[PDB]
Nucleic acid binder design. Sequence first.
RNA 1: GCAGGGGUCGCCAAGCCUGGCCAAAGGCGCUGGGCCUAGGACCCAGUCCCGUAGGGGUUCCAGGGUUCAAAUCCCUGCCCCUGC
Length: 333
Amino acid sequence: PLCLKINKKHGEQTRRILIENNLLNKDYKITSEGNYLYLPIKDVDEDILKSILNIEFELVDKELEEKKIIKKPSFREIISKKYRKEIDEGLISLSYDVVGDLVILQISDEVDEKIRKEIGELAYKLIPCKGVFRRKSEVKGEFRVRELEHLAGENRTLTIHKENGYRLWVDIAKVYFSPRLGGERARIMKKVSLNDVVVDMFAGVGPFSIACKNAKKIYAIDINPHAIELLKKNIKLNKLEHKIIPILSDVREVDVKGNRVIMNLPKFAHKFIDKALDIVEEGGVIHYYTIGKDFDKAIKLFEKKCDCEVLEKRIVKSYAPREYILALDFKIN
RNA sequence: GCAGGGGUCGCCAAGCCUGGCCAAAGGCGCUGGGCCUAGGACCCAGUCCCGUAGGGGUUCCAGGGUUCAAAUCCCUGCCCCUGC
Ligand SMILES: C[S@@+](CC[C@H](N)C(=O)[O-])C[C@H]1O[C@@H](n2cnc3c(N)ncnc32)[C@H](O)[C@@H]1O
Ligand SMILES: [Mg+2]
Ligand SMILES: [Mg+2]
Ligand SMILES: [Mg+2]
Ligand SMILES: [Mg+2]
Ligand SMILES: [Mg+2]
């Protein structure tokens, strides 16, 4: 539409200025005819333009040059405006998880299924994925899985996830995985000492183990057959066939010792402090996870257990208003 | 290497065809602040570097080069996973 014909010699320098005074119309693209450039501009006058532009220019009334070029908004952008109220009532969430090429939203079932489908639709439209789900139930069961409800894109739950350089087969509907724990996996990764024997008591599809590939031997344990199938595919996928030993079993009845022991089962980890201390060697170290309103009982209930030494204590994430997931590493003597 | 793919601001991942509101979307992580509950959460803000800002300085694996203008186009040094 309202263009500003200028010589290309001053294109960039002109665009810059026009952008600072916020005049460059952002709906159309800068076309070009010869030694000139047409720069879509918002309605202003010749003199105020002459003031901010140290050069010659015509306000040619060129043709639209096409039609508006919309800036694809962000899922968050649109969803924020359209539903601030229930986002504020806790029915729709702006945060979401993405595992491989699958996204998992959070929408309360109090919200209508038609809306949930439309929102799952925006997500598919506006977010780089192949499929969209939402959390159907909470994390429950001994396998620690959750119900999902497909909403858009492919109805698939198998995908490959990347974090810290490695890749992982994950079926978000048959096992427990949190893309959110990648940083946690990263710390511990810079601790494995190539001659360490690691015990992953609740290995899942194996992300913690794989993050400990430096060590000598790794023992990935898990009672969930579905988890073990994947764990195995990931060992091969990561060419770690001879460092990680998958073990379909209840950790309780497994005889292994190790200097590095991981207990990622924050809900019922306390029910296993014993079996760990067992597996862990004299000088060994046990990475323990749990929940609580604070670190108290976490350390209090480990004291009356052994010659421990709180190597490092931190907060992973709020579990609910107040309750937190904590990670303590213990030095055994 | 004859259907040929890839390295983007901690980890992921948009953009690249078609150069121009790109310091570069989102998610996660990290920081601060709310939230007695969506329970392995959720809301607000920040997150390349300097500033209170306006703005400035440096980035898209590393050079060179084309362009008024390059993460986007062109020969090219190192590295990596699918391959009538
Ligand atoms: C929290 S998940 C591991 C998640 C993984 N660290 C992640 O976030 O990517 C817990 C795993 O522990 C397993 N598990 C629970 N109890 C177990 C037991 N008694 N013996 C062996 N495995 C068990 C479950 O089957 C489940 O796969
Ligand atoms: Mg509430
Ligand atoms: Mg807080
Ligand atoms: Mg544009
Ligand atoms: Mg640029
Ligand atoms: Mg600042």
